[PDB]
Amino acid sequence: ADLEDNWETLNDNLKVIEKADNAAQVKDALTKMRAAALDAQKATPPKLEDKSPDSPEMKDFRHGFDILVGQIDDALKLANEGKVKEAQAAAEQLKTTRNAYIQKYLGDGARPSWVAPALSAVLIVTTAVDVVGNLLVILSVLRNRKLRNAGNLFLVSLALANLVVAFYPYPLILVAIFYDGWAFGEEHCKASAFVMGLSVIGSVWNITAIAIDRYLYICHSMAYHRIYRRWHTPLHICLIWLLTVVALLPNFFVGSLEYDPRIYSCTFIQTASTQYTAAVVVIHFLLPIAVVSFCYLRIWVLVLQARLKPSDLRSFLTMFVVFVIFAICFAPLNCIGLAVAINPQEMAPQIPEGLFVTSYLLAYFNSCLNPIVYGLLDQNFRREYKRILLALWN
Amino acid sequence: ADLEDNWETLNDNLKVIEKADNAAQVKDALTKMRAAALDAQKATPPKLEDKSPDSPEMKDFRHGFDILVGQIDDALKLANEGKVKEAQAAAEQLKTTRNAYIQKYLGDGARPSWVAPALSAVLIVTTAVDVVGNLLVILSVLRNRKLRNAGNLFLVSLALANLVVAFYPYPLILVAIFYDGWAFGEEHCKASAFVMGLSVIGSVWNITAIAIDRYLYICHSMAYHRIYRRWHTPLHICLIWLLTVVALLPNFFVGSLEYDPRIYSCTFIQTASTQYTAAVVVIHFLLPIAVVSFCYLRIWVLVLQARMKKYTCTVCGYIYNPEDGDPDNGVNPGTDFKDIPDDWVCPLCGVGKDQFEEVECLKPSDLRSFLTMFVVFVIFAICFAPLNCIGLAVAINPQEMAPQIPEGLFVTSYLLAYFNSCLNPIVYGLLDQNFRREYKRILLALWN
Ligand SMILES: COc1ccc2[nH]c(-c3ccccc3)c(CCNC(C)=O)c2c1
Ligand SMILES: COc1ccc2[nH]c(-c3ccccc3)c(CCNC(C)=O)c2c1
Ligand SMILES: [Zn+2]
Numbered sequence: 001a002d003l004e005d006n007w008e009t010l011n012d013n014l015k016v017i018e019k020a021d022n023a024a025q026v027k028d029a030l031t032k033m034r035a036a037a038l039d040a041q042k043a044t045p046p047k048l049e050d051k052s053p054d055s056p057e058m059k060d061f062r063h064g065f066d067i068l069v070g071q072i073d074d075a076l077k078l079a080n081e082g083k084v085k086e087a088q089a090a091a092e093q094l095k096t097t098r099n100a101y102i103q104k105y106l107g108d109g110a111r112p113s114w115v116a117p118a119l120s121a122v123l124i125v126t127t128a129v130d131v132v133g134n135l136l137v138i139l140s141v142l143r144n145r146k147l148r149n150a151g152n153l154f155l156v157s158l159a160l161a162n163l164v165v166a167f168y169p170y171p172l173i174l175v176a177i178f179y180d181g182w183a184f185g186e187e188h189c190k191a192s193a194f195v196m197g198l199s200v201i202g203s204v205w206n207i208t209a210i211a212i213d214r215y216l217y218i219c220h221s222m223a224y225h226r227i228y229r230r231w232h233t234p235l236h237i238c239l240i241w242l243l244t245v246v247a248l249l250p251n252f253f254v255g256s257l258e259y260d261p262r263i264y265s266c267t268f269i270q271t272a273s274t275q276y277t278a279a280v281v282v283i284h285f286l287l288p289i290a291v292v293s294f295c296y297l298r299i300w301v302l303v304l305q306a307r308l309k310p311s312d313l314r315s316f317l318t319m320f321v322v323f324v325i326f327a328i329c330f331a332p333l334n335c336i337g338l339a340v341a342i343n344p345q346e347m348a349p350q351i352p353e354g355l356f357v358t359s360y361l362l363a364y365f366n367s368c369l370n371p372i373v374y375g376l377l378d379q380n381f382r383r384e385y386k387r388i389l390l391a392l393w394n
Numbered sequence: 395a396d397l398e399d400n401w402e403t404l405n406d407n408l409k410v411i412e413k414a415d416n417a418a419q420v421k422d423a424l425t426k427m428r429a430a431a432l433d434a435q436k437a438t439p440p441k442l443e444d445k446s447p448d449s450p451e452m453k454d455f456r457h458g459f460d461i462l463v464g465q466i467d468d469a470l471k472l473a474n475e476g477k478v479k480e481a482q483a484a485a486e487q488l489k490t491t492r493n494a495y496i497q498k499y500l501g502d503g504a505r506p507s508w509v510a511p512a513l514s515a516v517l518i519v520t521t522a523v524d525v526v527g528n529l530l531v532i533l534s535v536l537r538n539r540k541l542r543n544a545g546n547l548f549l550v551s552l553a554l555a556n557l558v559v560a561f562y563p564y565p566l567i568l569v570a571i572f573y574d575g576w577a578f579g580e581e582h583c584k585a586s587a588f589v590m591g592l593s594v595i596g597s598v599w600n601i602t603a604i605a606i607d608r609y610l611y612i613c614h615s616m617a618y619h620r621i622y623r624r625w626h627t628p629l630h631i632c633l634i635w636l637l638t639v640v641a642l643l644p645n646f647f648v649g650s651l652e653y654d655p656r657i658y659s660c661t662f663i664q665t666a667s668t669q670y671t672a673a674v675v676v677i678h679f680l681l682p683i684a685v686v687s688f689c690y691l692r693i694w695v696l697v698l699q700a701r702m703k704k705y706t707c708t709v710c711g712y713i714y715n716p717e718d719g720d721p722d723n724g725v726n727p728g729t730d731f732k733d734i735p736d737d738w739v740c741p742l743c744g745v746g747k748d749q750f751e752e753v754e755c756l757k758p759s760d761l762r763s764f765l766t767m768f769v770v771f772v773i774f775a776i777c778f779a780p781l782n783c784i785g786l787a788v789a790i791n792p793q794e795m796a797p798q799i800p801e802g803l804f805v806t807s808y809l810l811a812y813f814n815s816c817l818n819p820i821v822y823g824l825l826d827q828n829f830r831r832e833y834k835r836i837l838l839a840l841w842n
Contacts (some may be wrong), residue, residue: 004623046622113624114625121633310477311476382415383415
């Protein structure tokens with residue numbers, strides 16, 4: 001039997017012992033566990049495959065199994081006596097506890113089998129739709145005199161924020177999944193973690209700048225037309241990106257950019273400094289999500305009081321949906337970060353790995369959604385996407 | 395303008411409204427449609443040519459146009475307001491009435507009398523064996539944990555490709571034969587046509603994924619085992635199905651999913667865009683048929699050379715398995731017997747490799763059933779080679795080569811292609827001993 005296959009066997013019967021109602025169900029499960037333990041001990045690990053069978057690295061895995069075999073025999077000594085709870089306790093609090101004391105028996109039970117293929121599928125799809133999708137957005141906005149419309153600079157600003165992350169950190173996390181551990185230097189670690197901070201942080205500030213601009217243009221159009229914009233807009237875009245770089249610099253002093261084995265990515269660590277992460281969740285999420293929720297509620301009340309035409313909603317509809325799609329995508333992880341920011345000594349271990357990865361899978365997915373919402377809601381973008389593709393077939 | 399000519403005009407502008415990006419493109423198409431409707435109303439139908447101009451049969455066609463002109467005016471009332479999707483939708487309610495009320499008079503309904511009973515017989519039999527047959531393969535693979543891990547996780551994926559089509563488009567077509575024309579909405583039309591595209595396209599990528607899998611397992615055995623798999627193949631299966639959905643999306647922009655009266659089925663149209671169909675025939679048939687013919691040529695050369703054969707011991711009877719090796723005495727799994735050094739001995743009696751003879755006859759279950767899998771590939775190719783040839787001939791020159799495709803031949807190509815949805819569970823049962831055993835275990839448990 002295969003080592004990866006035998007690893008699944010020992011964990012499946014471990015789950016059975018918990019959901020068991022009688023000592024015979026337990027004694028049956030503990031027999032399959034001891035048999036699959038001795039088979040996997042005869043097998044060679046993948047990381048230490050080149051190492052000697054007597055080497056201090058390969059003989060460490062062999063010995064780890066010897067401890068659990070005796071622990072299983074100890075547990076079935078109780079299950080034979082008809083003591084169900086007594087053996088059910090000697091299973092979970094001994095097969096897992098000594099696994100951390102054996103190290104190599106703790107790695108398989110740390111991460112679920114599903115995160116590696118789910119993450120890699122999500123990143124492949126996200127990177128693919130990102131490059132094509134946002135590259136179309138760039139080209140659509142560049143043609144003829146389209147750039148003379150200032151607001152189109154915000155679509156190029158967000159297109160690059162989405163884009164840059166697909167060209168540097170996303171490809172290397174995919175190498176980190178297939179190599180099981182970060183395969184590049186400590187240089188590329190903090191640098192990949194930084195550009196993702198630029199994208200995720202830089203995006204909310206563009207999304208906010210838009211919400212204020214579209215708030216004044218619709219609600220106080222008298223005062224809005226009095227104030228210029230043709231040159232104001234490229235100044236505002238430039239300012240938010242330098243503002244972003246500044247907000248990210250405490251990461252190098254507080255040491256919060258390091259590789260997270262749970263998500264195979266070098267990213268920002270919420271436990272490294274609960275002071276910085278508390279500010280990151282407030283000042284760079286709940287603060288902007290609040291002001292923009294306010295901006296767009298004032299716009300929707302005037303539309304509700306105006307009732308209509310498909311060309312009348314055109315001014316903001318596309319930009320409102322992108323904001324909402326952003327909020328959903330980043331609300332879960334910001335909640336995890338908030339719970340850790342209050343009391344990490346007790347609330348942090350209560351965050352399951354299954355939930356944590358689910359928060360990062362959505363947050364990564366957001367890097368490709370924008371051109372889709374443009375295609376589904378904007379007729380003029382849908383037309384533009386068709387023109388570019390036709391240009392390539394003709 | 396001629397009545398047959400005006401019927402082509404109203405259907406051409408109907409296609410334009412779908413592929414339209416602005417209300418003006420729609421308002422322009424709806425104006426040409428109303429004009430061509432009033433011209434055809436002034437014309438006499440061919441079936442009711444002998445009838446009186448005021449007769450209840452001839453005045454029925456005149457009134458049918460009055461309704462269509464009213465709803466065209468209703469649709470352009472939306473297109474003037476700048477509501478594109480709202481009028482694009484109200485142009486489908488116009489597509490139904492023009493195909494339920496105006497399909498009565500005119501039209502060349504020249505089909506042979508056999509295309510109805512043959513098609514319906516083939517579909518009934520195909521659907522029946524498809525459901526039972528592939529439901530057995532799904533069951534036997536998840537049931538037996540050993541045969542599942544033998545690279546046969548793509549077989550459940552292939553079987554789901556065969557199944558899905560028996561549950562939605564095949565039953566509908568059968569209603570389309572007994573009702574003589576598509577009896578369901580335009581919604582269920584392009585949708586049923588999509589579900590078939592998923593199966594036929596997804597199957598070749600499933601069949602390719604296995605051909606590569608067995609190619610590396612047999613030819614690059616050493617490097618193979620070095621690379622993980624438990625999480626690799628569910629990622630590969632997931633990738634092929636998204637790959638497939640992607641390849642099918644141009645159908646909604648080029649408008650190639652519509653009902654074909656010759657085959658009573660809403661399917662993909664080869665003439666709607668010869669650019670897309672040329673790619674469909676190349677990228678999704680001749681390209682994969684080529685790479686897999688390459689995969690199986692490099693396997694068959696090893697078999698001919700005897701480079702991956704089992705060796706039975708002429709003394710204690712121990713059989714050497716290249717898939718297994720002799721790991722405890724240094725020969726890691728995947729090693730060929732001809733590659734073991736001379737100092738190796740039988741691990742059961744100590745006789746030298748010197749006194750080992752090869753198993754002459756290679757069973758189809760061997761080397762992850764490469765023989766059974768190769769057969770399925772060949773069957774698939776025969777089943778879809780004719781229609782892909784028709785599609786290729788139409789893709790070059792459709793102005794002259796397309797009318798030269800007889801209806802009798804075209805339906806014959808679709809009859810085989812439909813039949814392919816049920817065959818593979820049979821080829822597994824006839825050639826794989828372990829599947830035949832599993833089939834019996836399923837049948838005997840439900841019976842007893
Ligand atoms: C402040 O310095 C950095 C620096 C790097 C960062 N990378 C990410 C991130 C990247 C991709 C997907 C989700 C989050 C955050 C945002 C992380 N937010 C929370 C609440 O943990 C981040 C922040
Ligand atoms: C490309 O988008 C679609 C979309 C739907 C499709 N349905 C079928 C098909 C279904 C059952 C039997 C035979 C063909 C093809 C395959 C059609 N291939 C050719 C050469 O015409 C198909 C393709
Ligand atoms: Zn022997």
